Amino acid sequence: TVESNWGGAILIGSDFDTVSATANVPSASGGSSAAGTAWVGIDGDTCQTAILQTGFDWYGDGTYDAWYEWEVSITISEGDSIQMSVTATSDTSGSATLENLTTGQKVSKSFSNESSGSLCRTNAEFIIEDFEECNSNGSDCEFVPFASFSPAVEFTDCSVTSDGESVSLDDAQITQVIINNQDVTDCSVSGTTVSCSYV
Numbered sequence: 001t002v003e004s005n006w007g008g009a010i011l012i013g014s015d016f017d018t019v020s021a022t023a024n025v026p027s028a029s030g031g032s033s034a035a036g037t038a039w040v041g042i043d044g045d046t047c048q049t050a051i052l053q054t055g056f057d058w059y060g061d062g063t064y065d066a067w068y069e070w071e072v073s074i075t076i077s078e079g080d081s082i083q084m085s086v087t088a089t090s091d092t093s094g095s096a097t098l099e100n101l102t103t104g105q106k107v108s109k110s111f112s113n114e115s116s117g118s119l120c121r122t123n124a125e126f127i128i129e130d131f132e133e134c135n136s137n138g139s140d141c142e143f144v145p146f147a148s149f150s151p152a153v154e155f156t157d158c159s160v161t162s163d164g165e166s167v168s169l170d171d172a173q174i175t176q177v178i179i180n181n182q183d184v185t186d187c188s189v190s191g192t193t194v195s196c197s198y199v
Contacts, residue, residue, distance in 0.1 A: 001179065002143040002177075005177060008175060009155075009158075012045070012122060012173070014121065016088060017121075018088075018160070019125070019126075019161075023055075023081075023156070024079065024154055025080040026153050027149065028062070029149075032061035041053030044123060052088055054086055064077070068098065075103060081102050093111055093114065094111050130146040130177050154196070169194065174189065
């Protein structure tokens, strides 16, 4: 039973522009069906009409993949340093960028005229998540088994902007992935770092 699927820091405000940070790719275990993901994004918390996000996944069988969303796919390896970033130029346009830094690869995606859902630009976040997997049309959805990972996934040089100005993570709310009434992450904040250890 997954009670909380998000772990990390969530900032609440207005006119959020850019959210970015660099995260290390951890080693994962627990089998091919076990997984986890690390991403940065805007909205999706108090703003439930849309979510601009980009990040990467790790599976218990040693594999990884990258994605963006308002598509999946750069090659990712354990230990790589990934710089993630999303920008919302308006409530219906923006961009998502992922840069491996270690391999020198980089992917980017520009969005515009997004009608299927607008942003509010009121939530900014750095998250570690036990994501869902759906199918059978759109009915059956389930949380993937949560993979154990190490070392801790750290979002360093975290950066949040609103109205062009910088916003610290000092007043961010903190959440933890919780399964079977047990914290499975220990995410904490400090300076410009959001550090999440698997538990």
